[PDB]
């Protein structure tokens, strides 16, 4: 099959995966059960990880692999509906290709219309770096609380956010920091230490001659019989090192985990037995079990979080949210430009192209209006999950935002009685909305150009 009929047998399948994660967007999402071909069971309410690993036939969903590995790593916040957001521009184009419109006319129509709404974002853009450290830190507390974490952390994010913000301030001028967690405890019982988490065990180290250091020793090569065995051990105690780390007393340390110990202690790895010296020893406060607790008295570049939860799935969901939280906060402090998300930013760009559609007119008149209707379907996803009428609520909000130029009032993702995102302190990165709404046109460039699909043999 070739031609327009072949394009409908593939591209139209994107509406199937869009309705799968449609109900899972935002805090109102529902837990969906997924089964991998290998037999593993994955249950989560985040649609970004659902479509990340899946077994499908049509290649129209295979283009989402580069989208999932990007938005989750670059931002992570609001990435649950990135496929629905990307299909929103496609669903409007599916009605245009039925009219006989050329794909480039559709691609250039959505590309220029998305650039006109950037000027509207600059008018409503704010800066969180211009305020003091009190307001800048408080904005990081409610940024991921009302948006990012959708599981159990709605009320309790104050514990996970405060531990995440303090980790950012310590290293402020995450790839060099290893973070993990063990199943147990609760949300508010999580502990924070300066160092790297060491799961391997051997007890208490007393203060040495130096202030706040153990003079830690790390030897990769094992001692190499009984005469040299006890002789090399006494050489470790010459510098006052009670704890020794060797591959073959802490033993069996991983390759990547061993380097994080030297990074936090600012030490060196001693391959031989003749290179042991006080200059090659790392600096660590003490090592004890409270899993050994590695503490650092002086401020270092390694600060990790230990996730605790009552369920084994909470540890996986809370830790993954922290990986995305470190990415959002990284872009907020680096990029001073910020916007108010949570339904306000998507509707903001819809009214900009709506007013510019009547100015250009021409053949792009209905093309610009379709780009406005494509952005209007994004809040319709959160409207059904919150119980609000998608057509009725937006028709009222577009009328209120017509008289008042402030676009912050809009659909609330939390479902509370406050429709103002500025009142709820919902702040999203400006580069985040750029990598979601604007970058989605780049993904549509591959979909709109689909014409004939070549299927080879075995």
């Amino acid at each position: 099959q070739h031609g327009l009929e072949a394009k409908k047998s593939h591209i139209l399948a994107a509406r199937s995966v869009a309705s799968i994660i449609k109900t899972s967007l935002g805090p109102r999402g529902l837990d969906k059960i997924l089964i991998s071909p290998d037999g593993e069971i994955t249950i989560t309410n985040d649609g970004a990880t659902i479509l990340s690993q899946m077994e499908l036939d049509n290649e129209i969903a295979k283009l989402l692999v580069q989208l999932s590995k990007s938005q989750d790593d670059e931002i992570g916040d609001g990435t649950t509906g990135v496929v629905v957001l990307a299909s929103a521009l496609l669903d409007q184009a599916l009605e245009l290709i039925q009219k006989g419109i050329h794909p480039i006319k559709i691609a250039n129509g959505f590309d220029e219309a998305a650039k006109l709404a950037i000027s509207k974002l600059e008018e409503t853009c704010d800066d969180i770096s211009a305020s003091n450290d009190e307001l800048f830190r408080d904005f990081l507390l409610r940024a991921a609380k009302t948006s990012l974490g959708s599981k159990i952390v709605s009320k309790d994010h104050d514990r996970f956010a405060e531990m995440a913000v303090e980790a950012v301030i310590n290293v402020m001028d995450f790839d060099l920091i290893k973070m993990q967690g063990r199943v147990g405890g609760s949300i508010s019982d999580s502990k924070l230490i300066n160092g790297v988490i060491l799961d391997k065990d051997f007890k208490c180290v007393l203060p040495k001659e130096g202030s706040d250091g153990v003079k830690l020793a790390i030897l990769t090569c094992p001692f190499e019989e009984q005469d040299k065995f006890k002789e090399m051990i006494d050489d470790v105690k010459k510098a006052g090192a009670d704890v020794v780390i060797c591959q073959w007393a802490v033993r069996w340390v991983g390759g990547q985990e061993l380097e994080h110990i030297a990074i936090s202690t600012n030490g060196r790895i001693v391959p031989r037995f003749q290179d042991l010296s006080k200059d090659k020893l790392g600096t660590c406060s003490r090592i004890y079990e409270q899993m050994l607790i590695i503490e650092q008295s002086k401020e270092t570049k390694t600060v990790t979080c230990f996730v605790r939860g009552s369920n084994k799935m909470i540890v996986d969901e809370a830790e993954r949210a922290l990986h995305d939280s470190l990415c959002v906060v990284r872009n907020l402090v680096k990029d001073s430009r910020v916007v108010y998300g949570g339904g306000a930013a998507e509707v903001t760009m819809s009214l900009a192209v709506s007013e510019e559609a009547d100015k250009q007119r021409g053949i792009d008149q209905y093309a610009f209006r379709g780009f406005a209707q494509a952005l209007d379907t994004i809040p319709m996803t959160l409207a059904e999950n919150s119980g609000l009428d998608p057509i009725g609520t937006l028709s009222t909000l577009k009328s209120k935002q017509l008289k008042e130029k402030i676009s912050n009032i809009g659909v609330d993702c939390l479902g509370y009685g406050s429709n103002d995102m500025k009142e709820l302190f919902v702040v999203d990165p400006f580069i985040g909305k750029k990598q979601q709404i604007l970058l989605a046109t780049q993904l549509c460039r591959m979909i709109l150009k689909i014409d004939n699909v070549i299927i080879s043999g075995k």
């Binding site: 070739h2 290649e59 580069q66 990007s70 006989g100 050329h102 794909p103 480039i104 250039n108 590309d111 220029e112 790839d175 060099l176 090569c221 190499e224 019989e225 040299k228 380097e259 990074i263 060196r268 790895i269 391959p271 031989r272 970058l439 780049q442 993904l443 460039r445 591959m446 150009k449 689909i450 014409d451 004939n452 699909v453 070549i454 299927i455 080879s456 043999g457 075995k458």
Partner: protein, 505 residues
């Protein structure tokens, strides 16, 4: 017999029907499905035909067309390659007829021979206007943007492609000389040009961020053997009397490595480049000297280093010469927690490096094809400057003069030449299906264009009407159009010369 050739052409035309939306900027990308789940969606026929499963052995000719397209010409795989087999489509009804293809092969051969003189006749000489490498290459760069997904954002690529080839020596232009670094993720406008040798990808182990990215004037150093303790060393026969004798091997291996690194340290090079990877034994030794070290250097990287500093691989410290120690004006490490070596101030370097960055891995793959196709346009333009309108509309005016020579035949080849001119009408017919335009409306005004205006008739696609691409600043090298018929001549004559195939087992 003749019936087997019909089934062979239909198999070749079957893939050409999907390759129609390629020639011209309005073409549409084609999707493929391989067995490795990794596919490349592009208008390029060399990539599609290489991964496409071939059934009939004569279908491998289309693969050889793309191989000969890059060797003889170097570009036009989205234009010339799909047109190499269009002569067999018009010759399909001739196979059922008693007409022997022996005269058909001579008919197309005499037709393309007289068309070369017509291409050079319409070729406009730009040297009279004193056009430098700016105005000449910029108008040709926008022509190369046809069949490419990037159109509105291609203005940034025009400045990058022209400035990269002008920095390279214009006497020797080759795709293997200039380097191309594809970096997934990020944005397209973040691509920059590199004035020196760059590393393949990156090496991240142990300390990474602790290396400062701001250097003054580093020096390049070359090494051969790998450095490590009791792991990658060469195995040898050593008599071990007791367990305590293992400490002598550690000293014998370290002193062998230490004396070689201490003798070469007298050069004072801030960059350590070894043919193999570098271990932690040399890392801590180089950390005290506060010098940068990078291993796992590919063979393609070392060839470009010789063109700049003039170094050589040193397996021992006795052959070290002062002439093998170079330097650089400025060195800065560039993305996704990956360091990128960037050299500057290398006037003697005959090679260039371009840093490409993009979010999609399939889109940047076509950008590499755009770089290889743009260099071939610049290479053939600087050698001979000629103006030919692109978009496949060049053969439109040529088809009128081809019908004049057919009237002087008065033989069996008269109707054969008319079929060659009819095959040229397939080019605008495939373009109307891509843009949705009416093919009859264009062909009617196509035959009426050569009766009045003549000259160049380009069928401008922007105004949705008929026009001239010469006034649109669309220029194409003539050597691509001249050799376009030569690639189709050997391709058409090869299939028509096989009346039967033989397959064993």
């Amino acid at each position: 017999g003749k019936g087997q050739i019909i089934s062979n052409i239909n198999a070749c035309v079957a893939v050409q029907e999907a390759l129609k939306p390629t020639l011209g900027p309005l073409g549409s990308d084609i999707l493929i499905v391989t067995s490795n789940q990794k596919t490349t969606i592009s208008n390029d026929g060399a990539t599609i035909l290489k991964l496409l499963d071939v059934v009939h052995p004569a279908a491998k000719t289309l693969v050889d067309i793309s191989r000969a397209q890059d060797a003889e010409v170097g570009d036009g795989t989205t234009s010339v390659t799909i047109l190499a087999g269009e002569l067999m489509k018009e010759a399909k009804p001739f196979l059922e007829e008693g007409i022997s293809s022996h005269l058909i092969m001579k008919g197309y051969r005499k037709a393309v021979s007289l068309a070369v003189e017509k291409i050079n006749e319409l070729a406009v000489d730009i040297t009279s206007e004193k056009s430098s490498g700016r105005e000449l290459l910029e108008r040709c760069a926008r022509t190369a943007m046809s069949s490419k997904l990037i159109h509105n954002n291609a203005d940034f690529f025009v400045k990058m492609c022209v400035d990269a080839v002008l920095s390279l020596d214009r006497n020797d232009l080759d795709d293997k000389l200039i380097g191309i670094k594809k970096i997934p993720g990020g944005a397209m406008e973040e691509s920059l040009f590199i004035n020196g040798v760059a590393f393949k990808k990156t090496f991240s182990y142990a300390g990474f961020e602790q290396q400062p990215k701001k250097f003054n004037n580093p020096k390049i150093l070359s090494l051969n053997v790998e450095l490590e303790l009791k792991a990658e060393k060469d195995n040898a026969e050593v008599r071990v009397e007791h367990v305590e004798d293992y400490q002598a091997i550690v000293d014998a291996e370290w002193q062998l490595i230490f004396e070689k690194l201490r003798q070469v340290e007298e050069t004072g090079a801030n960059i350590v480049l070894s043919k193999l990877p570098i271990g932690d034994l040399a890392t801590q030794f180089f950390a005290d000297r506060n010098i940068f070290c990078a291993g796992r250097v590919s063979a393609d990287d070392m060839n470009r280093v010789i063109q700049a500093v003039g170094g050589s691989i040193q397996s021992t410290t006795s052959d070290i010469k002062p002439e093998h120690l170079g330097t650089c004006a400025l060195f800065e490490e560039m993305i996704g927690s990956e360091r990128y070596n960037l050299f500057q101030g290398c006037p003697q370097a005959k090679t260039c490096t371009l840093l490409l960055r993009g979010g999609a891995e399939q889109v940047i793959a076509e950008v590499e094809r755009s770089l290889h196709d743009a260099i071939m346009i610049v290479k053939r333009a600087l050698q001979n400057k000629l103006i030919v309108a692109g978009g496949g509309a060049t053969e439109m005016e040529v088809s009128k003069c081809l019908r004049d020579y057919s009237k002087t035949i008065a033989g069996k080849q008269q109707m054969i030449i008319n079929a060659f001119a009819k095959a040229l009408e397939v080019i605008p017919r495939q373009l109307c299906e891509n843009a949705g335009f009416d093919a009859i409306e264009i062909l009617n005004k196509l035959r009426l264009a050569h009766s009045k205006g003549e000259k160049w008739y380009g069928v401008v696609f922007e105004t949705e009407n008929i026009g001239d691409n010469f006034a649109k600043f669309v220029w194409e090298p003539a050597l691509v159009k001249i050799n376009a018929l030569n690639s189709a001549t050997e391709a058409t004559n090869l299939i028509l010369s096989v009346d039967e195939t033989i397959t064993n087992k």
